[PDB]
Design an enzyme around this catalytic site. Structure first.
Site, short mmCIF file in Angstrom:
data_model
loop_
_atom_site.label_atom_id
_atom_site.label_comp_id
_atom_site.label_asym_id
_atom_site.label_seq_id
_atom_site.Cartn_x
_atom_site.Cartn_y
_atom_site.Cartn_z
N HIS A 101 0.81 -1.23 0.00
CA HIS A 101 0.00 0.00 0.00
C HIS A 101 0.84 1.28 0.00
O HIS A 101 0.34 2.34 -0.36
CB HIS A 101 -1.08 0.02 1.18
CG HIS A 101 -0.59 0.59 2.49
ND1 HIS A 101 -0.50 -0.19 3.63
CD2 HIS A 101 -0.29 1.86 2.86
CE1 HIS A 101 -0.16 0.60 4.65
NE2 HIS A 101 -0.03 1.83 4.21
N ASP B 28 -0.69 -7.37 1.94
CA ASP B 28 -0.02 -6.06 2.03
C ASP B 28 1.50 -6.26 2.35
O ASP B 28 1.97 -6.00 3.46
CB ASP B 28 -0.61 -5.16 3.16
CG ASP B 28 -0.37 -3.64 2.99
OD1 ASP B 28 -0.88 -2.90 3.87
OD2 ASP B 28 0.33 -3.23 2.02
N1 LIG Z 1 -3.79 2.25 14.47
C1 LIG Z 1 -2.68 1.85 13.78
N2 LIG Z 1 -1.70 1.06 14.29
C2 LIG Z 1 -2.49 2.25 12.35
C3 LIG Z 1 -1.68 1.53 11.40
C4 LIG Z 1 -1.41 1.90 10.05
C5 LIG Z 1 -2.02 3.10 9.59
C6 LIG Z 1 -1.89 3.50 8.27
C7 LIG Z 1 -2.57 4.64 7.71
C8 LIG Z 1 -2.47 5.10 6.33
O1 LIG Z 1 -2.62 6.30 6.13
N3 LIG Z 1 -2.44 4.12 5.38
C9 LIG Z 1 -2.44 4.40 4.03
C10 LIG Z 1 -1.79 5.50 3.40
C11 LIG Z 1 -1.85 5.63 2.00
C12 LIG Z 1 -2.56 4.67 1.28
C13 LIG Z 1 -3.27 3.60 1.91
C14 LIG Z 1 -3.23 3.51 3.30
C15 LIG Z 1 -3.42 5.30 8.72
C16 LIG Z 1 -3.60 4.94 10.04
C17 LIG Z 1 -2.89 3.85 10.46
C18 LIG Z 1 -3.08 3.42 11.75
#
Ligand SMILES: N=C(N)c1ccc2cc(C(=O)Nc3ccccc3)ccc2c1
Length: 245
Positions: free
Chosen positions: A46, A97
């Site tokens: 991702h 992922d």
């Molecule tokens: N609560 C968490 N541990 C956690 C983990 C991974 C995260 C990833 C994103 C994120 O922004 N992912 C992303 C970015 C670009 C494209 C697709 C997903 C947001 C919050 C998160 C919280």
């Protein structure tokens, strides 16, 4: 990383810092990763699927701060970006992922191990830690969900693994989380990974060995009550990782 503590790269020497060059030449931080072998870094698909050009990425090993050149660090380009062919994204959950980045310096070399650059070991088949095990995460992600800036100084925290049965409870993630994913979180919900930590390590000590048990993948919010961080379960992907390396 919400909560936790500031740290430096000598205590997490497998951590890779992955930036992206834009047209115009500005460079900005993207995601974390882990060194699995001198020429291979593993991260999350991702982090790259919307900008799939391998030439745009910069990977550093041995680096402790977002914006400065730590002594002993090493800078790299990406020779081969391999994304999982069955990767996909639902509203919350991300599937398969996982990604591999083959790295090379401008002279054509892979990483040189040192005190501040080292590999992390992969898991064995059908042997992950039991629920309730404490594991660490590391990254340059947000310290609070309302920040838009990332911390200048590398951070880490410790969280506990949660069973598949508990993670599928209806107030956690239901049937959205699968047997290929692992949940982990603080029992008091005060520390967690967050946006900017994706791709980075979940390292568990198991039977005496520090092991790359998971890769930061997804979660609802950051540090929210009954919303664990969710991680790719690396042991399922052992035949895919060997076949592509
Ligand atoms: N609560 C968490 N541990 C956690 C983990 C991974 C995260 C990833 C994103 C994120 O922004 N992912 C992303 C970015 C670009 C494209 C697709 C997903 C947001 C919050 C998160 C919280």
């Amino acid at each position: 990383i919400i909560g936790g503590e500031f740290t430096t790269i000598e205590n997490q020497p497998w951590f890779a810092a992955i930036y992206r060059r834009h047209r115009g030449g500005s460079v900005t931080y993207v995601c974390g990763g882990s060194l699995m072998s001198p020429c291979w870094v593993i991260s999350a698909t991702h982090c790259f699927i919307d900008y799939p050009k391998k030439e745009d990425y910069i990977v550093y090993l041995g680096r402790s701060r977002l914006n400065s050149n730590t002594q002993g660090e090493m800078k790299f380009e990406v020779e081969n970006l391999i994304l999982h062919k069955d990767y996909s994204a639902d509203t919350l959950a991300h599937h398969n992922d996982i990604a591999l980045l083959k790295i090379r310096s401008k002279e054509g070399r892979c990483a040189q191990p040192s005190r501040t650059i080292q590999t992390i070991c992969l898991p064995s088949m059908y042997n992950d830690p039991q629920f309730g095990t404490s594991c660490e995460i590391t990254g340059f992600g947000k310290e609070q969900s309302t920040d838009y800036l990332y911390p200048e100084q590398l951070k880490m925290t410790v969280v506990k693994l949660i069973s598949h049965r508990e993670c599928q409870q209806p107030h956690y993630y239901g049937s959205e989380v699968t047997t290929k994913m692992l949940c982990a979180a603080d029992p008091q919900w005060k520390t967690d990974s967050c946006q900017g930590d994706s791709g980075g390590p979940l390292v568990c000590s198991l039977q005496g060995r520090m092991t790359l048990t998971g890769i930061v993948s997804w979660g609802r919010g950051c540090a929210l009550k009954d919303k664990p961080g969710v991680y790719t379960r690396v042991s399922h992907f052992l035949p895919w990782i060997r076949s592509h390396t």
